[PDB]
Amino acid sequence: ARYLGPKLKLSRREGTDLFLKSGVRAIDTKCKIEQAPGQHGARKPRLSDYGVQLREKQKVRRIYGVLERQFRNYYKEAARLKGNTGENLLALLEGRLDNVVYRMGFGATRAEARQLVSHKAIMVNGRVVNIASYQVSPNDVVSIREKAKKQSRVKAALELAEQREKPTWLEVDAGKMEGTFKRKPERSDLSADINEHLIVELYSK
Amino acid sequence: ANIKSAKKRAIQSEKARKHNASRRSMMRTFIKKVYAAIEAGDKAAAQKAFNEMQPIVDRQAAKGLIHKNKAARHKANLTAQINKLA
Amino acid sequence: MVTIRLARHGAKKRPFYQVVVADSRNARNGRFIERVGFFNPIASEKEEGTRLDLDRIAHWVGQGATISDRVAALIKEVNKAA
Amino acid sequence: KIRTLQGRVVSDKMEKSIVVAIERFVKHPIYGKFIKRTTKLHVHDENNECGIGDVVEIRECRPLSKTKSWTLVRVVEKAV
RNA sequence: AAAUUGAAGAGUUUGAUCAUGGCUCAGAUUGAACGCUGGCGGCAGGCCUAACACAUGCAAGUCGAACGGUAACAGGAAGAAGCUUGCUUCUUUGCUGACGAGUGGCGGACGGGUGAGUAAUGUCUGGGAAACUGCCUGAUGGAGGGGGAUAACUACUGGAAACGGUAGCUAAUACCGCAUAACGUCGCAAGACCAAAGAGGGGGACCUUCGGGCCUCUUGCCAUCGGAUGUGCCCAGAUGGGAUUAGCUAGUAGGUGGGGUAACGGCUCACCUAGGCGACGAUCCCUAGCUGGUCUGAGAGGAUGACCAGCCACACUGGAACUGAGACACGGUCCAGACUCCUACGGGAGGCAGCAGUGGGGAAUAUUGCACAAUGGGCGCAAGCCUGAUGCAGCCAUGCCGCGUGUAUGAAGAAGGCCUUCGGGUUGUAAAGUACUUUCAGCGGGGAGGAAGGGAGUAAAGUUAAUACCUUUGCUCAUUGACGUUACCCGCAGAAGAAGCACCGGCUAACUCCGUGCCAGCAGCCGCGGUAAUACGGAGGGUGCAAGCGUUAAUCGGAAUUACUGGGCGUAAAGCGCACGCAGGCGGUUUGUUAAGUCAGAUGUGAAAUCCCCGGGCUCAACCUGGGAACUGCAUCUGAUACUGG
């Protein structure tokens, strides 16, 4: 139910950094970042219209750690919801607990944050939530529970976090290891070389 | 029958059947006497017979052997015809 | 006769009852005449959990409808609540 | 409260009965054209006052025979 | 506030083209199966085939507060004794807590199963009038005085069994007279006529035949008029196909009268009239349970009727009625048929389309489980008893949803493999190493909720002669969970036990080498294979999915490819060889009228669930749930009169 294999392969295939490692290292010193995996990585894909749509959807999925079934269901919900579907898809992803745990800096990666969640190290409103896809709401307070507070992963995670751009819609107290999901992120909060409308196109045909 | 009470019910329903049959046969007899008088043209015999019949079609109604409406028609019908002749 | 009782809906281990007026012979979750309340035994009790249209319940009693042991309890409980 | 039908007499042969035809236009469920439909009713005519071709007003009543559940109310127009 | 605010195209005829036209693909969906693989959980689903046949258990009982009663076990007792003098065992007696068999009452018409039959004594929508209706309910009165029986039992007797035969004998809320009898039935009326049943709980003077009287309350019984629920009946529209089926019909269509039903009715019979149905599809033939809804589609449609709910029909096959408020009875009766079982050979017995289970058929569909704790049904004043309804558990990846199978760091980037022009590229931060976490599975510890009630006491009110009893409502005490090792929470051990499947020529995301050589083989469509095959088969690499993945089957979509919305017929499939013409469709222009079509409004109905919208509850989700909106439909009334019809 989770992708467990090599991670930089995914970045290499999509042509971009997917933040699947902590960021302690320039990614180009860990892999040949600008070349696809495999014997024929140097080869260029003269890539069809379907192809660009597929790869964009894969990219987003691989960023958030979501497999097809759940992600399709995410599209369905984005569509059902009011307002722009493409933007609704990203709101839903960005509201996941494993994700939010990552953005408050409690985990070096979404993979690490997910493990924190699954392993009962995260509370929401002082209540233990251990499922990664838990949808987090405005004004919620997610926190590292007392017993998980001395984990060195978390301190390192918060350090790296302090060096990333700081997300607007979250208020994080690094000392308490608690943080507040102030509001749903706008579209403008999220990276601009994500092409949701391509993903929207892939799932309407 | 297979079930204990099913057996008992068949026994009771047979008893009731022979009870009802007996009273019902009696009743129709007393109804038939009236129609027979009518068909012979006698007011008195037919009125007399109607008077014997009345209390028993009424009673068998009260006793559930027949419904009230049946008792009534019989009285209505015979009364109609006997009057129409004398 | 006509009776007022609980038809058990909800899910496994999470009972949820629909209070209904019905011909007592029909199945518990089958044909009914009128729906008249509900009863959640698993309500958090932070908010609601038991709602009865007492006006229509009484109307039906006035016309001879009987009442479950469990509905007879709910009614005394709800009458106490307010 | 007098529910009623209007139609014309297609047969007056029977003793104290009549056959009445009620005709109406109806939208076709699929192709939209308006189609003629007819409903023939066996109706009671005590006194046989209804002639064939007459236009008559009829009403629904209890069963009068295997096929009669309607009786005559009154004649409207006659002998065209 | 919101609540249908939604719609894609690709390959393939040709040397190439445009058109025509079929085939094929991308999508959703499934009660699925098979092949490979397979960790946990929540919720759902699970004989689609043979309405084939079924061993065994279980699935309908209950009331001693209707009745005679004791045979079991349980006490109790004058009196027998265990006697070691209060502990007792048996002989006895229903004395009573109870209770086998029996009469009696209520239930066995519900609940549960199936879809064979049925194109209509069906269903859906909407209306009618001639009716019954247990239990529950409001109203008003009865509940008087008698009689003959009978099961059980007793004696004698026949049977292998099933089950009988004689004569005794006895009870009742079993059964029948008699009285009483109207706001009931018949009748214009005068009049005439119809019923019943007791049983318990407690008790003050009072007293006897010590049974009770009598006092009191509960409950059942009878009558009549209502309510509520259920059911029967009637009309209209709609609800499959076929003309290689065009005529059908004697109870047939109607009328009169008798009979009949709970009730209208050719329901039935006699007589009379000669009708009734049919091209607006009768008759005949094929098929089929109908609906809410389900799947698909932007919609209009198309397909469909498991799981949930409503109606119908059936209960081995054909027929029949008896009992009953209700049945022509799913675990009742009778007859006939098919079939099976028992037998001492003479005779008997049974009907899983209830729940498990078996054989058979099949590509294929589960345990001969636990519990009445909860909801609900039957009986009972109750306690309670019964409940394969139901709640649960087992089995299966069948589906949906959730989670895991680790996280981070880790380079000249090892070995091995693979490609290479031998420079190197790749597998690949992948692995090893380094720290780090412990969900789930394992193991110990603790521990919600589904529980409302019911039981003893108590107190107050209504009762009443009464502080009894009864009933209601408060109080305290001790109690009721099949699931269950529950949900959930804490602790321990270690990355430890948890990854496979299909694909990579174009459509279509993913390319190379070796082997083979029109072979072996692939193939949804085009089309691959005779020496460079990205198409066969293996490998390395890659793509897509992931506890699944593929293949097959199946509906709709794309298919504007049955075209109502939404197409065509000169040469592509398609104008009858030509004309006349009935039915039918359509019909110039003016006025008046009508108001069926059409339009408007109002009212009722359109079950709930489902779908959709906004909320609420399970850690999330599936799932459960509140309210709304929607059900685009039907019907009645009242209007409007331009258009269509008269």
Ligand SMILES: [Mg+2]
């Ligand atoms: Mg999954």
Ligand SMILES: [Mg+2]
């Ligand atoms: Mg008559």
Ligand SMILES: [Mg+2]
């Ligand atoms: Mg060619």
Ligand SMILES: [Mg+2]
């Ligand atoms: Mg296997």
Ligand SMILES: [Mg+2]
């Ligand atoms: Mg299950």
Ligand SMILES: [Mg+2]
């Ligand atoms: Mg079965």
Ligand SMILES: [Mg+2]
């Ligand atoms: Mg007994």
Ligand SMILES: [Mg+2]
């Ligand atoms: Mg009696």
Ligand SMILES: [Mg+2]
């Ligand atoms: Mg009398």
Ligand SMILES: [Mg+2]
């Ligand atoms: Mg008496």
Ligand SMILES: [Mg+2]
């Ligand atoms: Mg007649």
Ligand SMILES: [Mg+2]
């Ligand atoms: Mg069939």
Ligand SMILES: [Mg+2]
């Ligand atoms: Mg079923």
Ligand SMILES: [Mg+2]
């Ligand atoms: Mg089933």
Ligand SMILES: [Mg+2]
């Ligand atoms: Mg159903």
Ligand SMILES: [Mg+2]
């Ligand atoms: Mg039969």
